[PDB]
Amino acid sequence: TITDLARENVRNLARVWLNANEYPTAVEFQLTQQTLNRYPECQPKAVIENYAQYAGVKPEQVLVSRGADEGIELLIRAFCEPGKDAILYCPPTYGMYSVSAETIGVECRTVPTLDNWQLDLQGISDKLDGVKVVYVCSPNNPTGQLINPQDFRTLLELTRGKAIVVADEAYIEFCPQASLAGWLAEYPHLAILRTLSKAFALAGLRCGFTLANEEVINLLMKVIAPYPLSTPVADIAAQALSPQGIVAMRERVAQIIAEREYLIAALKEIPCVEQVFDSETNYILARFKASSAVFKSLWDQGIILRDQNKQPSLSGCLRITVGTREESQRVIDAL
Amino acid sequence: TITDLARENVRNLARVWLNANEYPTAVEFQLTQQTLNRYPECQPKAVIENYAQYAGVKPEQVLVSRGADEGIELLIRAFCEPGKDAILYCPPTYGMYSVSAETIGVECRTVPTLDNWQLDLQGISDKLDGVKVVYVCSPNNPTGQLINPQDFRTLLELTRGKAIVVADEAYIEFCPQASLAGWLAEYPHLAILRTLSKAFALAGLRCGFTLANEEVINLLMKVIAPYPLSTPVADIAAQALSPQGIVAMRERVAQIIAEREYLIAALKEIPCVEQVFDSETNYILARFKASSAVFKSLWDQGIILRDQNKQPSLSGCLRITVGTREESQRVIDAL
Ligand SMILES: Cc1[nH+]cc(COP(=O)(O)O)c(CN[C@@H](CCC(=O)O)C(=O)O)c1O
Numbered sequence: 001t002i003t004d005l006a007r008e009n010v011r012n013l014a015r016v017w018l019n020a021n022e023y024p025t026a027v028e029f030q031l032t033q034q035t036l037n038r039y040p041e042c043q044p045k046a047v048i049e050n051y052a053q054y055a056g057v058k059p060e061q062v063l064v065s066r067g068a069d070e071g072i073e074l075l076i077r078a079f080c081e082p083g084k085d086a087i088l089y090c091p092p093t094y095g096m097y098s099v100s101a102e103t104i105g106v107e108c109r110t111v112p113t114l115d116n117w118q119l120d121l122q123g124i125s126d127k128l129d130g131v132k133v134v135y136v137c138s139p140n141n142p143t144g145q146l147i148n149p150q151d152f153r154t155l156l157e158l159t160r161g162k163a164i165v166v167a168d169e170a171y172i173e174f175c176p177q178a179s180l181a182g183w184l185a186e187y188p189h190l191a192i193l194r195t196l197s198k199a200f201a202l203a204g205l206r207c208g209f210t211l212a213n214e215e216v217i218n219l220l221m222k223v224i225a226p227y228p229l230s231t232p233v234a235d236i237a238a239q240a241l242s243p244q245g246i247v248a249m250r251e252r253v254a255q256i257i258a259e260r261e262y263l264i265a266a267l268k269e270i271p272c273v274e275q276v277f278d279s280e281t282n283y284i285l286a287r288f289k290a291s292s293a294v295f296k297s298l299w300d301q302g303i304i305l306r307d308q309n310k311q312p313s314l315s316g317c318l319r320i321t322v323g324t325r326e327e328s329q330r331v332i333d334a335l
Numbered sequence: 336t337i338t339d340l341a342r343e344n345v346r347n348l349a350r351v352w353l354n355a356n357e358y359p360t361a362v363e364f365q366l367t368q369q370t371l372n373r374y375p376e377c378q379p380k381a382v383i384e385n386y387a388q389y390a391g392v393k394p395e396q397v398l399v400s401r402g403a404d405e406g407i408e409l410l411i412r413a414f415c416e417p418g419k420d421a422i423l424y425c426p427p428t429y430g431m432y433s434v435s436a437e438t439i440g441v442e443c444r445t446v447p448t449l450d451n452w453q454l455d456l457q458g459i460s461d462k463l464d465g466v467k468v469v470y471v472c473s474p475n476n477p478t479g480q481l482i483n484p485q486d487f488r489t490l491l492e493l494t495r496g497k498a499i500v501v502a503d504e505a506y507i508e509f510c511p512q513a514s515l516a517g518w519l520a521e522y523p524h525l526a527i528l529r530t531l532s533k534a535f536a537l538a539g540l541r542c543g544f545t546l547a548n549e550e551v552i553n554l555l556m557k558v559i560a561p562y563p564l565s566t567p568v569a570d571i572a573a574q575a576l577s578p579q580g581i582v583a584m585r586e587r588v589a590q591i592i593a594e595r596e597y598l599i600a601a602l603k604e605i606p607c608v609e610q611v612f613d614s615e616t617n618y619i620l621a622r623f624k625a626s627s628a629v630f631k632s633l634w635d636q637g638i639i640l641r642d643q644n645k646q647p648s649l650s651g652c653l654r655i656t657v658g659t660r661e662e663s664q665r666v667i668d669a670l
Pocket residue numbers: 019020021066067068069070094137140141168170194195196197203206207208374561
């Protein structure tokens with residue numbers, strides 16, 4: 001039957017919302033370009049330049065795509081040979097790295113991080129043979145911490161002329177000083193993923209970026225879809241990336257950080273809450289006493305969180321996205 | 336260097352506009368959903384149901400994606416094993432079939448059509464070994480003619496339990512009675528590509544569809560991106576696919592067909608115009624005397640067409656998209 005014609009790997013491979021790391025409030029935007037009958041630019045000029053000014057890079061070092069998710073796929077499609085090359089990631093982390101490789105047909109090499117979520121440098125150096133792309137989320141999802149920049153430098157020296165190192169900075173707006181965007185001059189093999197889905201409050205736009213050196217970007221352009229971005233998305237993205245939009249964005253980051261600190265202080269006092277881990281993002285990882293029990297309870301109360309109990313070493317943990325003061329108080333009361 | 340890390344195939348692999356088959360006039364649309372902070376549905380309910388009513392299929396037989404282009408890729412990603420499986424197409428036709436396979440790493444089997452653009456059935460039957468997906472554009476781009484339904488039935492009998500047959504109906508709105516959408520009940524391996532880019536006048540939305548049986552659609556869902564469509568695109572798409580939107584669309588089809596007939600009558604009278612081929616779409620293929628000479632001339636006059644002189648058997652031909660009466664008269668006068 002039809003199913004027998006599909007590739008073997010393809011055969012084998014939810015919706016108070018505080019589970020997807022979205023900004024809790026909707027920032028309104030309206031269209032300004034009524035040119036829907038014509039195909040859009042392959043890489044919207046206004047979007048690429050506005051983002052390059054914001055990120056502090058050159059326009060030729062930016063690539064716009066359908067979220068950071070498409071960015072993850074592009075890197076594998078351009079550098080990894082199916083059945084020959086490997087990808088490497090360090091659990092517990094964002095699940096789309098292995099899903100894309102599994103869907104495409106590339107092998108996964110996993111080197112779990114140390115107990116403090118930091119990189120197991122010696123383990124990575126031992127499993128690099130055959131690896132073409134290394135993904136590192138910093139700050140990490142779901143744990144919330146930054147990877148020591150000194151260890152990142154070591155990772156970069158290890159992969160020079162061997163593999164591409166991709167730093168997922170989907171949550172960098174929360175700790176802007178920790179960005180590796182300035183390292184592009186020093187490292188040809190460094191690529192960074194960015195997005196408008198979190199701090200920018202535009203998850204519905206499906207708009208992301210890849211920051212890398214001209215050489216890498218030019219290669220990715222060869223594997224990307226002819227018109228990866230719609231005109232309405234490029235329209236709103238340029239409005240959100242204007243100087244006033246970047247000011248409003250920072251106001252949002254501020255509000256979330258303040259609220260995050262309140263939520264962390266309150267959670268520590270709660271008995272069932274065994275441990276609250278520090279974060280430099282818009283979510284909090286916390287180990288609970290009988291996590292799935294409390295998860296179901298809140299779930300039945302209309303408080304949607306994200307269970308991480310199945311993740312390597314995240315037994316008993318739930319990931320809570322930071323929302324409004326009313327939503328935080330709602331989770332506090334329920335606990 | 337960086338380039339040496341890329342896959343071998345990746346290393347090796349323009350903007351009066353009448354060159355992209357777009358509707359000449361912009362139909363205005365405005366947003367109605369200010370929920371941009373939240374991730375969109377993976378498959379927008381309103382879009383899938385409105386399109387299913389229009390196309391006359393069941394909602395479970397529809398898949399919405401970023402244009403018919405993503406639809407072409409999905410089929411190869413789900414059914415073709417890189418380095419093992421093959422794709423088959425019949426030149427001269429739409430160029431994205433071979434580009435997607437070349438980018439992914441799948442081999443192309445080409446069986447050029449007969450002199451009248453119809454399918455070389457015996458040639459296809461001889462090159463089917465190893466083929467997993469067969470693409471057939473009907474009506475064809477750039478020639479404009481329909482593939483004999485009797486030959487399509489033969490193609491379908493030849494591929495039963497061997498390969499998926501995909502009918503590209505990107506231009507079907509111009510000859511709706513010629514659609515193979517009703518054949519889904521009879522053929523499990525039949526898939527159809529649709530789009531909002533032409534008659535629907537929404538090329539800027541990057542919104543397309545794949546019509547197939549539940550089994551095929553469920554497999555494609557496994558290889559597609561988590562949120563392939565943005566909220567603003569799903570918003571406008573549902574507005575355009577409402578009963579009133581389908582009525583307005585048909586008005587557009589009517590206007591284009593009438594204009595097409597005018598443009599064909601006028602072109603025949605012109606001396607340099609050697610031959611004008613009949614079309615069931617929104618473009619016209621025509622063989623000219625010194626085609627690149629006339630192409631450059633019009634190009635220098637701000638009249639942009641599409642050169643097909645390099646396509647197999649399309650030597651001396653230019654593809655002219657049907658626009659407004661003023662644009663047609665502008666091309667007539669220039670000739
Ligand atoms: C680390 C990380 N990297 C990349 C992305 C991709 O973002 P985008 O630009 O939207 O493609 C995400 C979103 N992961 C969130 C997905 C939520 C959802 O799917 O819904 C998450 O983990 O909550 C990440 O958490």
